[PDB]
Paper text:
In contrast to animals and yeasts, CME in plants depends on the TPLATE complex (TPC), an evolutionary ancient adaptor complex. In this study, we used a multidisciplinary approach to elucidate the structural and functional roles of the evolutionary conserved N-terminal Eps15 homology (EH) domains of the TPC subunit AtEH1/Pan1. AtEH/Pan1 and Pan1p proteins are both hallmarked by the presence of two EH domains at their N-terminus. In conclusion, our parallel structural and functional comparison of the EH domains of AtEH/Pan1 revealed two divergent EH domains with differential, yet complementary functions.
EH1.1 consists of two EF-hands connected by two short antiparallel β-sheets. Anomalous scattering supports a calcium ion bound in a pentagonal-bipyramidal geometry in the loop of the first EF-hand. No anomalous scattering signal was detected in the second EF-hand loop, but electron density consistent with the coordination of a sodium ion was present. With respect to EH1.1, the NMR and X-ray structures agree very well with a RMSD of 1 Å. The major difference between the two domains is at the interaction interface of the N- and C-terminal ends. The hydrophobic core of EH1.1 is shielded by the proline-rich C-terminal loop, while in EH1.2, the proline-rich N-terminal loop takes over this function. On the one hand, EH1.1 coordinates the PA molecules by three main regions (residues around K42, residues around K78, and residues located at the C-terminus around K97). The N-terminal double NPF peptide of SCAMP5 was identified as a significant interactor of EH1.1. Bio-Layer Interferometry (BLI) confirmed the interaction between EH1.1 and a peptide derived from the N-terminus of SCAMP5 with a binding affinity (Kd) of 59 µM via steady-state kinetics. Mutating the conserved tryptophan to alanine (W49A) in EH1.1, and testing its binding capacity by BLI confirmed its essential role. We conclude that the N-terminal double NPF motif of SCAMP5 interacts preferentially with EH1.1, mediated via a hydrophobic interaction with the conserved tryptophan residue.
Numbering used by the authors: 5 to 105
Write the structure that this text describes.
């Protein structure tokens, strides 16, 4: 499957209970494979849980994956970078991240 959807594959791996949402605990466990600091992952979680419900839907989780890629590229998150990933078609250019599984 050379064109396999890696965002979807990560969503399915992260969603341990199959309820179609990524819970806080599921995100903590999944992103332990990201190589990022807990401070950065906290900021990504906050930015991604747009409804403040404690769960990420698919869109929210894919956006958290995009922010993880930017952080793995050693770019400092700025308000402009965050908005570019969350609210503009620049998001489509961001690869899925590398996650140790
Ligand atoms: Ca879940
Ligand atoms: Na939410």
């Amino acid at each position: 499957n050379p064109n396999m959807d890696q965002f979807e594959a990560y969503f399915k791996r992260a969603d341990l209970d199959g309820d179609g949402r990524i819970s806080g605990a599921e995100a903590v466990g999944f992103f332990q494979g990201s190589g990022l600091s807990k401070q950065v992952l906290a900021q990504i979680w906050s930015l991604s849980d747009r409804s403040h419900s404690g769960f990420l839907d698919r869109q929210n989780f894919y956006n958290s994956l995009r922010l993880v890629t930017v952080a793995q590229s050693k770019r400092d998150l700025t308000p402009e970078i965050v908005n570019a990933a969350l609210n503009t078609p620049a998001a489509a250019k961001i690869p899925p991240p590398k996650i140790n599984l």
